[PDB]
Ligand binder design. Sequence first.
Ligand SMILES: CSSCC[C@H](N)C(=O)O
Ligand SMILES: [Co+2]
Ligand SMILES: [Co+2]
Length: 282
Amino acid sequence: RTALSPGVLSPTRPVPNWIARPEYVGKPAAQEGSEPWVQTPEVIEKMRVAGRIAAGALAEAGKAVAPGVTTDELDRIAHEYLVDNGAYPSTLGYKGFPKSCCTSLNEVICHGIPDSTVITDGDIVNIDVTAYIGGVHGDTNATFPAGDVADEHRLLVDRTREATMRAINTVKPGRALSVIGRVIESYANRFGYNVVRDFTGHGIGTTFHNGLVVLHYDQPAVETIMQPGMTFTIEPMINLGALDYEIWDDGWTVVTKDRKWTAQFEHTLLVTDTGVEILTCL
Ligand SMILES: CSSCC[C@H](N)C(=O)O
Ligand SMILES: [Co+2]
Ligand SMILES: [Co+2]
């Protein structure tokens, strides 16, 4: 299959006007970056509802992954599940992003835009979906195989999933945050993969990316200690080839320079009083 090129973007999907928009919608920037890392009990409970709903939207768009389907079509299914459940799609109008999820085929690392692109047999596609409901966000993504995927690509997907889950199972209060990126990177390196450094996980709460940064590679200079009530994502991008990338002129789509494929999984995590809870399960 040849290297991807930009497809054609369908017009802005509407969302019912009664659904509250995040503040950043239709503005050039978002007011985020300086919010508290530890959330209130109320915000946490609200994030469980946002997380469930984004998990539902993700599993529904993933069902439609099949040779012949377009990315635009995955967006539509995800959009429709968020809206039917009262959530705003956080990606929509975030810094000018035009769709309700990111769709990231094969050599696209992240931030791909749903479009006329038709999925072909053997492809892998990441769907990344975020829900905003009750003044809070819930963020989750996953890579789905399309028909008959080559063994090297199934293993990549399976091992990216496993890295992500291993990292999550280390989350506990009083443990250093740098532990996550140690675990992910050892695991990736074990099988010859390379972890994307330039994109990271993030704190998330009443804002989308609240200023907390979770590195997916080994960086022990970070002194952040996990505390009960902290909410963040773990979202590692793992490459078969080299880490160098380019961005499309749409300004969002990141693609591996060598055009080798790449995969990603994401959950939204709560640090509990003794451990972790995954907020983006069905
Ligand atoms: C184009 S919206 S910013 C990246 C999308 C994703 N939901 C994330 O931040 O994990
Ligand atoms: Co995220
Ligand atoms: Co995401």
